[PDB]
Amino acid sequence: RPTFYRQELNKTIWEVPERYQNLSPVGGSVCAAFDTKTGLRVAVKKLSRPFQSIIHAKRTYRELRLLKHMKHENVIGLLDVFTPARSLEEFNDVYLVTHLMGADLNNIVKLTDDHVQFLIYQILRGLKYIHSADIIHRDLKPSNLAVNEDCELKILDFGATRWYRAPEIMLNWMHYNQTVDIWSVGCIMAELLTGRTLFPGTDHIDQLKLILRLVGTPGAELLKKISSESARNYIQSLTQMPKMNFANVFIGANPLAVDLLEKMLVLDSDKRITAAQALAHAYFAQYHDPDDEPVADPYDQSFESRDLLIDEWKSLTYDEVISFVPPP
Ligand SMILES: Cc1ccc(-n2nc(C(C)(C)C)cc2NC(=O)N[C@H]2CC[C@@H](Oc3ccc4nnc(C(C)C)n4c3)c3ccccc32)cc1
Numbered sequence: 001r002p003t004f005y006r007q008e009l010n011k012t013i014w015e016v017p018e019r020y021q022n023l024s025p026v027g028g029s030v031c032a033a034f035d036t037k038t039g040l041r042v043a044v045k046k047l048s049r050p051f052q053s054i055i056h057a058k059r060t061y062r063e064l065r066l067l068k069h070m071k072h073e074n075v076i077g078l079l080d081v082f083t084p085a086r087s088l089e090e091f092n093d094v095y096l097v098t099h100l101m102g103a104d105l106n107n108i109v110k111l112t113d114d115h116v117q118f119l120i121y122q123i124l125r126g127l128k129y130i131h132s133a134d135i136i137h138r139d140l141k142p143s144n145l146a147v148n149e150d151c152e153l154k155i156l157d158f159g160a161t162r163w164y165r166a167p168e169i170m171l172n173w174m175h176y177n178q179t180v181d182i183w184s185v186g187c188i189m190a191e192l193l194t195g196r197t198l199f200p201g202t203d204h205i206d207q208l209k210l211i212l213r214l215v216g217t218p219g220a221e222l223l224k225k226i227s228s229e230s231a232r233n234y235i236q237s238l239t240q241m242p243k244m245n246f247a248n249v250f251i252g253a254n255p256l257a258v259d260l261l262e263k264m265l266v267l268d269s270d271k272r273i274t275a276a277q278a279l280a281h282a283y284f285a286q287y288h289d290p291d292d293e294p295v296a297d298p299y300d301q302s303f304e305s306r307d308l309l310i311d312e313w314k315s316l317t318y319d320e321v322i323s324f325v326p327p328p
Pocket residue numbers: 026027030043044045059060062063066067070075076096097098099100101102103104130135136137146147155156157158159
């Protein structure tokens with residue numbers, strides 16, 4: 001068992017192995033550190049009172065289980081996970097360690113067409129992987145994309161969101177699909193090409209109106225899929241609007257970029273391009289290699305249907321800390 005040392009940083013106590021030096025805040029709370037074992041800089045997340053409730057306890061387990069599974073160049077992965085606790089009984093703190101990228105996509109974004117190709121290619125390559133595990137990110141946005149000085153990119157999730165959200169989520173459809181993430185990538189790509197927020201809505205109603213102004217009000221095929229009478233009464237009561245000409249709206253962009261945007265920002269989620277289809281789009285011909293775009297190992301999310309005690313979620317989490325094997 002390693003030797004821990006204790007310090008206070010910003011009202012927060014950090015008790016970490018001596019392996020990790022030079023802790024400095026960035027954000028749970030997050031520190032940058034130096035990993036003396038590898039010579040690389042790391043980000044360390046301390047979970048805030050991980051067993052305060054059944055929902056916290058289940059969140060704690062969910063994040064550890066997801067981060068242990070993710071092994072892809074464009075998705076956050078775990079270098080280490082530790083607790084200063086020496087027994088299950090005393091276990092009350094979880095620390096997660098990953099590679100420090102040093103910036104997010106806002107920070108980058110303060111870009112050529114070639115930069116946009118490479119950045120969106122990497123997002124889609126990570127999303128292919130995630131979606132192959134039957135996971136939906138649900139909150140992709142610039143601040144959940146970590147970028148290093150080489151413009152290498154990883155998807156993560158820190159836990160306005162609404163600006164990149166799919167319209168079917170603003171409408172509160174409970175049966176939305178993976179392509180909510182492709183909507184978000186569309187919103188991000190538009191913002192990298194134009195340097196403006198595509199849909200900077202002030203609330204869920206404002207956000208939906210900005211969206212329908214570009215993509216048009218629902219057509220008949222989509223209206224027939226809407227179960228909610230109140231949702232339909234509302235949408236069909238708006239001034240009806242055609243889909244705009246994306247070629248006019250994004251005029252000046254690489255027409256190949258515009259063509260992909262149209263495939264991502266289709267209003268009916270059933271007609272949106274998937275991540276795997278998007279990687280094969282001609283816009284990524286300089287990056288696409290179907291032999292180097294892997295899918296995930298099977299991901300057991302059956303725990304999500306369970307109603308357990310805090311102590312049960314805690315013991316499961318504890319077993320996941322103990323079984324952790326670092327990457328070579
Ligand atoms: C309840 C729950 C919450 C999140 C999730 N989740 N789901 C996912 C995917 C994408 C769906 C697979 C990922 C996560 N969790 C997650 O991403 N953790 C990050 C959150 C902050 C992060 O801080 C970092 C990390 C790297 C980094 N590089 N640069 C900088 C800035 C300081 C500039 N970083 C700043 C982190 C540092 C350690 C360890 C972990 C983490 C699942 C469940």
